[PDB]
Structure 1
Amino acid sequence: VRPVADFSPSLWGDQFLSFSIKNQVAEKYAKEIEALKEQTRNMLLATGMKLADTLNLIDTIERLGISYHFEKEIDDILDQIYNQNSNCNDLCTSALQFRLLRQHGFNISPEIFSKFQDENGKFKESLASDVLGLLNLYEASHVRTHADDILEDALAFSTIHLESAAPHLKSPLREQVTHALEQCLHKGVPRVETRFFISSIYDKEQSKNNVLLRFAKLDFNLLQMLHKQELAQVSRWWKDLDFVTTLPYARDRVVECYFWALGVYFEPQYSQARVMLVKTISMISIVDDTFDAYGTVKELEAYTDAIQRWDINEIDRLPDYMKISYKAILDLYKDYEKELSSAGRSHIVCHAIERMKEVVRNYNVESTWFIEGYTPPVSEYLSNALATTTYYYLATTSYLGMKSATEQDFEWLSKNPKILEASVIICRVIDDTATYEVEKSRGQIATGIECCMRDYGISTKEAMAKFQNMAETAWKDINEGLLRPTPVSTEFLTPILNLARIVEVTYIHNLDGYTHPEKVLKPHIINLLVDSIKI
């Protein structure tokens, strides 16, 4: 109750509080899109297309962010391509084939890349002057599984040569290439990459397809109207409880939390789900700050205890300010119960609650360790720190609003499947690398990186690197987790992959973009939620 937190306040003020949809623009946009959608569908169903032209078609529709209209169409075509083991075998076309099929769960063999390597298993340097090939190899290299050692040098090979070529390339290729080196496609946030592709690249293409371009622009701008509605409604919900003033020790980041929810899914069909999810993110952010930047060892115990018991009767046992958090929390979940009552999917809230209880227990442990000055071995540290990412919790939460999610889906998730552990590890390891210094100067001894130095007996940098490996292993596990046959439908894997993406995108350049949103998140939020795409 006496630590002075240097949390910058919300960048946004009330600018998101009111949004009145221009129903006439909306209906106009919607009507034209039906037509462009249909034309685009026929583009996909065109018969007798070259392989390379079909893959570029699907890639472009995917990068323009409109692929969610043609899930069946795009699937059938990739299925067909997979089962054909094909005979268009230039580097460009092969790497793109590999990437698209793999991203869709088709376990295409990495043997396709042998024709491009010497007898030493190294990529032929004679390819260093095929820039489009190098670019697609580069993107493909980020979808490695552990079975794909054949690609172990694709990333360094393509990188060194893209770097060397980039400055002399025409536009917008030069810009595409430069952006890819900064942010690969597979690990970027979908809305972020789509907005960059439409405005910065495709729109400046000499060969651009006008139908697809108009389509992409109207759709993005139309969905954005929805997100703005969601954000506004969520902004009033955040307002009508005023933790801004009530709980001034906490980070005020509901816009940043909505961005997180939007990264997990952007499709209109997940509107209910996004709104539930972002509420949870906001709330848990509060609890996190509570344990970490204000409440006392004594108060936290009462808090954890109450959370585990989960009944209002316990409020009185908590100091006045924790009564606020605590009731809001309990209400939020009764709200969820109401929203889901309509469809009789109300029972499923308990899975999310159980995961929240878990997070809090581990927050309390993390606190005990801080007081005692305990520096666990990495094993023990991880056994506790993984859940305090909140990622088991958010992933579970992300299913609430999803109308098709069943009990078997939650029963899979509850077992900590490998794809979820990987996403959780990526978040943990990235947050620890980014926040090493600030937490260490603030009297932290239980820091993940400290445990790693003290445990293995290695420098701050040697520990930084081991953590990077864990994240890289983790991505290979995510990539392997998407391959068919999948343990649950792909729709329930994507949010977990997306959770991994958001942490990569937000901690880019190794900085806590959530706590300090100005450098990185702000531009994203502006491009996704403030500015429309100029038609």
Structure 2
Amino acid sequence: IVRPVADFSPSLWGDQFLSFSIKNQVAEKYAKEIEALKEQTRNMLLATGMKLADTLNLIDTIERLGISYHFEKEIDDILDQIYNQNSNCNDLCTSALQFRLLRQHGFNISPEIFSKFQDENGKFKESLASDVLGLLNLYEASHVRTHADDILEDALAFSTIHLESAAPHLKSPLREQVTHALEQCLHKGVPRVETRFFISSIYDKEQSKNNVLLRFAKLDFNLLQMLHKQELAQVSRWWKDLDFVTTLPYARDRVVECYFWALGVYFEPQYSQARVMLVKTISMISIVDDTFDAYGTVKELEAYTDAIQRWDINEIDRLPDYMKISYKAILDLYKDYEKELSSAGRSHIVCHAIERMKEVVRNYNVESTWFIEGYTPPVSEYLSNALATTTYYYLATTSYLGMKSATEQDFEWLSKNPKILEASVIICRVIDDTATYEVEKSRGQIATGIECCMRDYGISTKEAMAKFQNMAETAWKDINEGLLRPTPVSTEFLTPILNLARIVEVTYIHNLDGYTHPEKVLKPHIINLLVDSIKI
């Protein structure tokens, strides 16, 4: 058996993450000051007699500065009061921000708040085109709509064309904020990534900045970064000691990029155990993917698939040596998870992730069968298989394992494929298919999403990519709707699903596979989040 020759780029990080020693004196100093700044900030939020516009701007600033996770109760109480008092008497700037903030927090504020800014025809008044802060906030708000918000149908196009027109003559840092927003809206960005940009490029350069908030944000970002580096060191050593880099050289070596993925799902310190469990799974399923896609023979992949279904160390001997390596690593990883969750009495929840992993591998094998047979399924059949091969049902399930508050009922809800999860999975599927179409096509993969779409509907690549873009837009509206109260589970368990969809948008920005090719997109993010501290 002569295998397909390896074409993946090596890890561009080497060992620079392998060893990190926290400076305990600096850490304790930061924490000590943060506690003080945190209280000053809490008192800013609980201050009586603030105007609506001032209250919304304070909350928005604290959220963009990445420090709102300290104030979830206070912020929720304030937005809840604003929701219930129903103040519809403001300018575009305040109205659009009110709408976005309430919607992002699950408060179903009516989109009729925008009627006064539109003409008889439902189109935004073009007289608003000279109000740059109104346009910017309308732009950001336009990305949080549901299927019930067609009054906002025109908002993205309207704000975009006029922000583009105004941008070159704006003062700084407003110009840079607008320019950034047009490339990456806030709602669909990875929170740490957007926070890092906001702190260093915008708020640090604002003449009006609050000094207490800016210092708080910098110390907190840098203190959390220390934790992330410890985690990544710990994960880098784990990966190094598995040595897939040499024993499975056909596979993508991307444990840092996998860590960036897990960091996108949640960054807070209470999810430290969850992040570390998650990155290990993302890493390991990546190995399995490359085995199906770029190395294993039809017969080998059949044995591997069957062994995964049986999930028994007795099955190893049915496998080629090189498959024994990953199979044992997989079984051991889940034994690790079980032991790690023992003292909290949560070991039994590991089986939910295992069953999702089995599902991914069955569908990998189907995809391989399709390839060998030269089968091009209809789109409905394609999706019934290819949705799971995104790994996103599996990653979402995995994200709950290290979350101490996740219960059987939460896993039960997730197991039924709720709409918000299905949407996030669909976004991953259609975005990846649009970006990897040409490549997979060159490699003879006739069952690619876009190809199935073209053959099924009898349309061009352009029309098919446009139809896939529509599916992604529909799915984002489903995600936004899925966040609205009353939620079927705690918001804490919805946000990881939302964040998975954000990571897709951020990683495949400009229609390129950033995970397989980290140099262009992921490398700057990893440097900003995990290498360079914010200068104070």
TM-score by length of 2: 1.00
In 2, distance between residues paired with 1:270 and 1:234? 15
Structure 1 runs (4+) greater than 4 angstroms displaced: none
State the Cα deviation string for residues 203-251 of structure 1 (Å, max 9, x = none): 0000000000000000000000000000000000000010000000000
Provide the rounded CA distance (Å) in 2 between the counterparts of 1:234 and 1:88.
52
Alpha-carbon distance in 1 for matches of 2:500, 2:312: 30
Distance of 1:165 and 1:6 partners within structure 2: 45
Alpha-carbon contact 2:316-2:324 (below 8 Å) kept: yes
- Partner secondary structure for residue 251 of structure 2: coil
Confirm or deny: 8 A CA contact 2:99 2:141 kept in the other structure.
yes
Tell me if structure 2 keeps the 8 A contact 1:391–1:424.
Answer: yes
Which whole-Å CA distance do the structure 1 matches of 2:86 and 2:345 have between them?
A: 46
Distance 1:376 1:187 in 2: 31
In the alignment, the residues of structure 2 paired with residue 153 and residue 361 of structure 1 have an alpha-carbon distance, to the nearest angstrom, of: 43
Return the offset for 1:89: 1.3
Determine if contact 2:83/2:102 at 8 Å carries over to the other structure. yes
The question of 1:19 aligning with 2:9 is answered no
Alignment check: 8 A CA contact 1:51 1:88 kept: no
For 1:189 and 1:483, locate their aligned partners in 2 and report how far apart those are by CA, in whole Å: 20
CA RMSD of aligned residues (A): 0.4
1:155-177 Cα shifts (integer Å, max 9, x gaps): 00000000000000000000000
Q: What SS does structure 1 have at the residue aligned with 2:511?
A: coil
SS in 1 for 2:49: coil
Specify every segment of 5 or more residues in structure 1 that has no aligned partner in the other structure, as ranges.
none
Aligned to 2:353: 352
**Whole-angstrom CA distance in 2 between matches of 1:252 and 1:509:** 23
Taking the aligned partners of 2:74 and 2:6, their CA distance within structure 1 comes to: 52
What is the CA-CA distance between 1:121 and the residue it aligns to?
Answer: 0.2
Quick one: distance in 2 between partners of 1:251 and 1:495?
Answer: 25
The alignment status of 1:458 with 2:459, answered yes or no, reads yes
Deviations 1:55-111 (A, max 9, x none): 000000000000000000000000000000014410000000000000000000000
* Partner Cα distance (2:138, 2:234) in 1: 43
Q: Deviations over 1:7-66 (max 9, x none)?
A: 000010000000000000000000000000000000000000000000000000000000
Mapped contact 2:292–2:368 kept (Cα < 8 A): yes
Task: Tell me, in whole angstroms, the C-alpha distance in 1 between the residues paired with 2:88 and 2:385.
Answer: 50
Please give the alpha-carbon distance, in whole angstroms, between the structure 1 residues aligned to 2:341 and 2:89.
50
Give 1:498 deviation, angstroms: 0.1
Residues 1:87 and 1:453: Cα distance change in structure 2 (over 3 Å): closer
Aligned to 1:74: 75
Secondary structure of 2:509's match? coil
What SS does the aligned partner of 1:347 have? helix
| 1:52–1:88 Cα contact (<8 Å) kept | no
CA deviation digits over 1:352-386, x for unaligned, max 9? 00000000000000000000000000000000000
Q: How far did residue 4 of structure 1 move?
A: 1.1
Q: Does the aligned pair in 1 maintain the 2:140–2:186 contact within 8 Å?
A: yes
Q: Give yes or no for the alignment of 1:401 onto 2:395.
A: no
Instruction: Please tell me whether the aligned partners of residues 235 and 254 of structure 1 are also in contact (alpha carbons under 8 angstroms).
Output: yes
Question: Do the aligned residues in 1 keep the contact of 2:88 with 2:113 (CA within 8 Å)?
Answer: no
8 Å CA contact retained: 2:138, 2:155: yes
TM-score normalized by structure 1? 1.00
Deviation track 1:250-273 (CA, whole Å, cap 9, x = no partner) reads: 000000000000000000000000
Contact kept, 8 Å, 2:62 with 2:68, in 1: the verdict is: yes
* C-alpha separation in 2, matches of 1:372 and 1:311: 30
Q: Percent identity?
A: 100
Q: Contact 2:139/2:159 (CA < 8 Å) preserved in 1? A: yes
Determine the structure 1 residue equivalent to 2:96: 95
Provide the rounded CA distance (Å) in 2 between the counterparts of 1:403 and 1:8: 37
- Give CA deviations for 1:321-350 in whole Å, capped at 9, x if unaligned: 000000000000000000000100000000
**How far did residue 5 of structure 1 move?**
2.5
Cα pair 1:422 1:474 within 8 Å, conserved: yes
